Structure formats: C-alpha cells, structure tokens
Amino acid sequence: TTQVALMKLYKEYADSAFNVFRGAGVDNVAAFIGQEPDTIINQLKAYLEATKKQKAAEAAAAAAAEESGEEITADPKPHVWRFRALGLNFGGDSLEAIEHDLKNLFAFDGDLAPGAARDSDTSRSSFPNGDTYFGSYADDVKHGPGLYAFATGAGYAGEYAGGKRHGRGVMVFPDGGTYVGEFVADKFEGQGQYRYPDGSVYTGSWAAGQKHGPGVYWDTARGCLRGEWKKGLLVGKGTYEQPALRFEGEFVRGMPAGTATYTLTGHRTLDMPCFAAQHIQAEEGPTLALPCAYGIPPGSGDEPQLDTDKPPLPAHPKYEGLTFTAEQLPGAAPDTVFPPEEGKPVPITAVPAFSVSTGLVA
C-alpha cells in the first residue's frame, strides 16, 4: 500500500437529488418512491420551477454584471460545504496509477472499497454535465429505488436496474408534461399514463418510447379516440367519439382512409315537435349512419418513410389531399351515448355527456 486517502471536503448545491428528497420528510428513498404519484409529481414540478427560476436569475445577474462593474468571479448557485471522513488504502506507483478509483472517489459518495465495485444502498452520485442521483447501487451501476435530477429541470423517481430505468417510475419533463407507468431502458414500455403540456392525456400502451398497442387518447377537444396504434401513429380500425357523433374506420399513418362509417344523431331538434306523430312515442331516436369513405393521395401514406415522388400527408390547419365519398342512403343506426364506456374513467376535467333522453348536460 502506497497511498492513503483520508478526507473529502466536498460542496453540495441546494438543488440536487439530496434536497428534493429532504423536503419530502419521508424516512428513506423506498418511502420517497412509495408515495402516491400525485405528490411525487408535484415535488418534481416544484424542483423544475426552482431550476428555471435559478437559471433566469443567473442570466439576469450575468447581464447586469456585464453592463457595469467587473465579472462575477464567484459561484452564484447556493452551496453548503460538507466533509466525509473516509480513509482508504490504495496500492500503486504514482497518483495517475489509480485514476479510476480516485475519480470514483471523486463523485460516488457511498461505501467505497478499493478495487471493488460500488454496493452502497444510500449513495449519492454527481455527474459531469451537472445532473445528480440519489439511491442504491449494485455491481458498479444504479439498481433499486432512486431519485434522479437532470439539471435541466426534468426529473425521475422510481425503480432502476441495469444502470438505467426499469420497472415502475414517475417522470417530469422540462416542457411540463409528465408520465406515470412502467419503463424499459431509458424509454416507456408496457402500460402508462402520459399527460401533455397543452392538456391532452394518453392512458395506454407503450413500446420503446412510442405509443404502441391498444390505445385510448383524450384530446383537447374532449373527444375519445381508440385504436391499435403502431410506432407512434394509429393504424387500422379506429374510433372517434364526440358528444353527438361517432366515426369509425381505417386510419393509415395517422390519417383516415378507406371504407369508413359515420353515426350521429340530430341533437339540435330533440325538443322541437316531431314531423310525424308515430315518432312521438317510438323508442328509436333520430340517429343516422352513413357508410362513407375517405381518400388520400395515391402516393402519400403508402410508403412507411423508407428514406421522393410521394405527395405529403395532409396537415392540420388545411387538409390538401383528403377526399370524401358518400353514394348511399343513411341507415338509421341505434342510439349513441357520448362517454364511450371504453376508457370510461375520464382524465380530462370538463367533459359533457349526452343521451337521447337528455341532451348536452354541460
């Protein structure tokens, strides 16, 4: 043995994986990830807000310092010095002969054993770009419950394995969206609920960071869209339901096409007198079904982006290439109530209901 490392006088910022945890007031990390997901999400959102505020304040201070006076020449972040009294023996020839361990002893604050992989269960880990980790290690990587801050505002709390995300977890992204569900590697997998920043919510299946499998989307127009989505887009028979109407048909590459079917009921004249007396006491409501069909440009959507002599898909504001065809009479389909009963729990706040007996409630 040639060297003994017998101190570490480190410095800790007031926003890391060891201060989101402390504000919670729980006992340990397994009790931090074990809370109800709403409070986890709220705490991570508060951390994101703190990071954004700190960045804005730093930028303003830097601009003011440039305007007059001299440079800042000091760390503006809030920092509190801490001291680990660790003592370890390393055997080598010079300081550069143990570099791994030394730089390991730089950042991982757990149970250091010279020449051995990390196995701490309450370890902290800094990182080059500035993002921090709190949780358990095993076989030199992260494994088990953890809290993890990205230093850009984002944040994760949940299970780790193989050095990456695995199992159940909760994440908050810098834009404002959030995710609650299962994870494989660094991307979504299995079942989960994603909430977008605009207000929409998707509660369904995921494969490798994209929507895949049975899916139920609840957009900002308070309409329910159900289908079997594939690689981030909806393919096959899909259903869109709105308080008065229900459209079902094939989608290709996220846009309607092929033989479809509209079914909707006159809600405008449910209280007006009927034109025929026999409609007064009948049980069949005023609902009609049209066997229509959409149309797409003959090159668009037929190629799965094999990267062109292909027309572009119609966009949102104005759809350029969509056609539409109805050449048969309506067929008087039965009644439709708006809440589809598939995806019955409504994540969105303001969703009005409908029925033949009672019109739009809200």
């Binding site: 791994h100 390991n104 950042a107 991982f108 992989a117 990390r118 880990s125 990182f127 080059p128 770009n129 993002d131 030199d140 990587v141 992260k142 993890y148 990205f150 850009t152 984002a154 050095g163 990456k164 995300r165 992204f173 810098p174 834009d175 969206g177 660094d186 991307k187 994603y194 977008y196 605009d198 929409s200 998707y202 960071g209 994209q210 929507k211 989307y217 957009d219 900002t220 127009a221 309409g223 869209l225 909806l234 899909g238 869109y240 459209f247 996220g254 846009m255 309607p256 509209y262 229509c292 959409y294 119609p314 949102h316 759809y319 969509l322 056609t323 539409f324």
Partner: protein, 39 residues
C-alpha cells in the same frame, strides 16, 4: 337577391379526427458513471 338554403356548392370533407400531440425529445438520457476497469 339570395333565396335558398345557406349551403355552398363545393365538395364537402367532414373534418378528420383531431391530431395527437408528440412526446418530449430524448435529450433526457441518464448520465452514467463509467464502469470498473476489468482485469
């Protein structure tokens, strides 16, 4: 003068179902401590 139903004689396309939003990018990847030097 205009006398008739207020309907235009143009091809009519029923508006297709509304667009789905997109997730975040993947500039959020877990920075990892570099693994042990194997012997």
């Amino acid at each position: 003068v205009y006398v008739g139903w207020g309907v235009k004689n143009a091809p009519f396309v029923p508006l297709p179902p509304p667009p789905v939003a997109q997730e975040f990018a993947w500039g959020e990847v877990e920075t990892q401590e570099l693994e042990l030097k194997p012997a």
